[PDB]
Every structure is written in structure tokens, then in C-alpha cells.
Design a protein around this ligand. Structure first.
Ligand SMILES: Nc1ncnc2c1ncn2[C@@H]1O[C@H](CSCC[C@H](N)C(=O)O)[C@@H](O)[C@H]1O
Length: 258
């Protein structure tokens, strides 16, 4: 048994209203009221389609991942990671792929800066299409379960997916939903040995998930990095100024790139 699983159990034991408070406790939020209000009205212009744009922003503006070349966005959902990549100096093709359909997030068409370089496909399942060439590989897949055993298999499927997609020097950002289970640790140590990078916690993540992202330009003992987060997440159960701090939302320009 791990320090993560302790966290998981305490989390699971929470009152409905107690969990809602834990979730936002001392996190970083993104200011989305107006951007969402604009989208509801048609505006295709300056708005990130989701808070993922801001979320990826954070890794990128710190050179943890430098999208370049042909970017594949596995599970692009609405499109927040892709449209944000679309505007990035070093970037040529953005290809975003996602399930969509009833009960899943569908890609929203946007005219943001570099939109013309972004193509997003709904109706695809990625675990069952063939790997393609790419320079930057992104992946935000991993559905949360109260049962950590579940999360570990979901997380395992994902890494096993990404491997098949990766070559040498590939820029990458992958959600590892449950990095604390011992099966996931094991896989990650391998993956790191073979590919580099470390796991990093994004301050925009809620306290109710123990997600960390495997990002390419970083280093660090996996085990230790997972633990300092389980510790962090446990410490936040007992918190005494539990407001969130807010960032203004990414503004993603408009119009076309050549
Ligand atoms: N096997 C699969 N194939 C394609 N899409 C999948 C998938 N499993 C999960 N997904 C999709 O992956 C998405 C990840 S969450 C979307 C976040 C996105 N980066 C953004 O910033 O908006 C979900 O919307 C889900 O529908």
C-alpha cells in the first residue's frame, strides 16, 4: 500500500459538501466567466474553448514542453490544447482527435489565431487507430474512478498507447491520471528510462485528482515526485485559508497564419 492510496481513501470518505471545498482548496483557478459567456453567444474569436488552454499554457510557458512541427492532440475534446498550440510560433500542423458523440465533449469550431492550421476530428477512438509520425505528442485522456484499481488500468492503457506513438526527441505532454499505484509507477520508470522527462503537477489541477503530467523536458525521480504530491494532497485536507487564486484566461487571438 502507498501514500497515494491513503489520500484516495480519505478523499472518498468525504461529505458531499466537504469534498466540494477540498476540491478548490488553495488551488489555482482560471477566470472563465466572460470567455464562456462569449462562446455561448457564437464568438469564435478570442476565447479558449475550455480551461485546458490555460492548463497547457502553464507547462509550455515554462519549457516543460515545447510544441513544434506536427502536433498530435490525443483526446482533444472541445479543442483547448490544439487551438492553443495552433497559435504557437514553432508549430506547423495541429491534428486533434477525440470520441465526441452524445455524452462526450464535441470539438467547437474557432477562428482563433492559427485556427487554419488546426484540424479536429470527432468520432475517433484513439486506442484503436494506427500510430502516425509526429514531433509533439499531447494526451489528456483518463477518466476518474472512486476505485484506484480502475484508475490504474485506465492510466496503464494510456501510457501503453503513447509508447506506440513516440520516437526519438519527440516533444510530449501526457496526463498520468493515477501515478500513485504501484503498477503505474513501474511502467513510468521504464518509460522514463526509455524516453526521459518527469512527472509534474500543474497547479491548475484540482485537489480531487492526483493527476501529474509526464512532460518531456524535465527530470526527476518518479517515486519521489509522486510522493511529494501525495503528501501535498494530504496536507490540503486540513486547510485554513482555502480560497483559490485566479489567473485571467489565455486570450488566443484571431485570424490566420501562413
Ligand atoms: N479513447 C478515446 N479516443 C478519443 N477520445 C477520447 C478517448 N478517451 C477519452 N477521450 C476524450 O478525451 C478528452 C480529454 S479532456 C479534453 C481536454 C482538452 N485537452 C481541452 O483542453 O479541452 C475527453 O473529452 C474524452 O472525450
Amino acid at each position: 500500500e502507498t501514500l497515494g492510496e491513503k489520500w484516495k481513501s480519505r478523499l472518498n470518505a468525504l461529505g458531499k459538501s466537504e469534498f466540494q471545498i477540498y476540491k478548490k482548496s488553495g488551488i489555482q483557478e482560471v477566470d472563465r466567466t466572460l470567455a464562456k459567456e462569449g462562446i455561448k453567444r457564437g464568438e469564435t474569436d478570442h476565447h479558449a474553448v475550455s480551461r485546458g488552454s490555460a492548463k497547457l499554457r502553464w507547462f509550455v510557458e515554462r519549457n516543460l514542453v515545447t510544441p513544434e512541427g506536427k502536433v498530435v492532440d490525443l483526446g482533444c475534446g472541445r479543442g483547448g490544447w490544439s487551438y492553443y498550440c495552433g497559435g504557437l510560433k514553432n508549430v506547423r500542423e495541429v491534428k486533434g482527435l477525440t470520441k465526441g458523440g452524445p455524452g462526450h465533449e464535441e470539438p467547437i469550431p474557432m477562428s482563433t489565431y492559427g485556427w487554419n492550421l488546426v484540424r479536429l476530428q470527432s468520432g475517433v477512438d484513439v486506442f484503436f487507430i494506427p500510430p502516425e509520425r509526429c514531433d509533439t505528442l499531447l494526451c489528456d485522456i483518463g477518466e476518474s474512478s472512486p476505485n484506484p484499481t480502475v484508475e490504474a488500468g485506465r492510466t496503464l492503457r494510456v501510457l501503453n498507447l503513447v509508447e506506440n506513438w513516440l520516437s526519438n526527441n519527440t516533444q510530449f505532454c501526457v496526463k498520468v491520471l493515477n501515478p500513485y499505484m504501484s503498477s503505474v509507477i513501474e511502467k513510468m520508470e521504464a518509460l522514463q528510462r526509455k524516453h526521459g522527462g518527469a512527472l509534474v503537477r500543474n497547479p491548475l489541477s484540482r485537489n480531487s485528482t492526483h493527476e501529474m503530467y509526464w512532460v518531456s523536458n524535465a527530470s526527476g525521480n518518479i517515486v519521489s515526485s509522486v510522493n511529494m504530491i501525495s503528501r501535498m494532497l494530504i496536507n490540503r485536507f486540513t486547510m485554513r485559508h482555502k480560497k483559490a487564486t485566479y489567473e485571467p484566461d489565455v486570450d488566443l487571438g484571431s485570424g490566420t497564419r501562413n
